[model samples]
Target: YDIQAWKKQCEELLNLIFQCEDSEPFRQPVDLLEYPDYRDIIDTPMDFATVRETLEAGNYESPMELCKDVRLIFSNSKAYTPSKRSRIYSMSLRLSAFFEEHISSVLSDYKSALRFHKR
Candidate 1:
């Protein structure tokens, strides 16, 4: 699919994830002042805002490309907070699972649309 179509679908999925209540912590880039060593542990930091910007800029080649960063947001959170019982860690797991389930649906629907478009 073209970037334009990909952007539309990616934005829709992103908007859906943004509305999730557990999404608060992943909404913005982690503040250095709050977590001074964030960069130290995380090699590549990602967040919803940056992912949205990248999508809007037409930087992503496909929905999977966008999903990589989305997954990174949660993985990074989990990595930083090793304690499975931590609130942020659990939130990341929940939201990541939520995203995975919904993204599969979005991808399947889009693939069907592409197939129809070809015919």
Candidate 2:
């Protein structure tokens, strides 16, 4: 697998994300996809625009779309541990945590990007 591309996109997401004062970001209590019924069919094409818009809107379900659409980034056929999904959960926690840690840097990177993007 082209891990480079996957990691690039993942980091792009991290860079793009910012939490405004609306309370918090990614407010979903838990991922719907963890339930078998919530997972999309493998053949379903990714809705690229909406995902970006969702992030820009700062929606709670954005990470779900990320892991679902780019499942290989979290888990792949060639290599993966059974806890890959758990790894994804861990990622969200850290991502949100670090947002505050370096929010000033992120803001300097894109002043408006951090101030108000939550939806």
Candidate 3:
């Protein structure tokens, strides 16, 4: 493809990479309060008037917090926690290849990518 076309493809792919990077372990909101009987426990006070308040929250953030639980699912494939994260890393490596290919398409020099990166 032409240099402009190659660069555009690469640019679009970078966003795709980012889309995969945002994946996180999540569950339905209703499941969060499934065991409503325990709502009155120490952490909470299930009063008569508050029993049916509601449980509308949904799609929680994750199996791992931003700062904690890195190793919890980091190695577990198919979970989308670390599994999805690995995709981004691989995509990053391809970016360099894309850069080189686009540069070579226009400049006809394999070393052009290196020079661009160097600068």
lDDT assessment of candidate 3: 0.29
lDDT of 3 by residue, 4-116 (tens): 23234333433343344232121111122643533243232221111111211212132111112212212222222234446533443344344344434433322354455
Candidate 3 TM-score versus the reference? 0.20
Top candidate when judged by lDDT against the true structure: 1
TM-score (all chains, Cα) for each model: 0.84, 0.24, 0.20
- lDDT for every model? 0.85, 0.38, 0.29
Model 2 lDDT, residue 43, Cα: 25
Backbone clash numbers for all candidates listed: 0, 0, 1
Candidate 3 residue runs with Cα over 4 Å from true position: 22-119
Ranking by lDDT: 1, 2, 3
Badly placed stretches (over 4 Å) of model 1 are 1-4, 109-119
| Tens digits of lDDT, candidate 1, 39-119 | 999999999999999989879876778888998998899889959899988889899888898788656766766777787
Model 2 stretches with alpha carbons more than 4 Å out: 1-35, 39-51, 54-85, 103-119
In TM-score terms, which candidate is top? 1
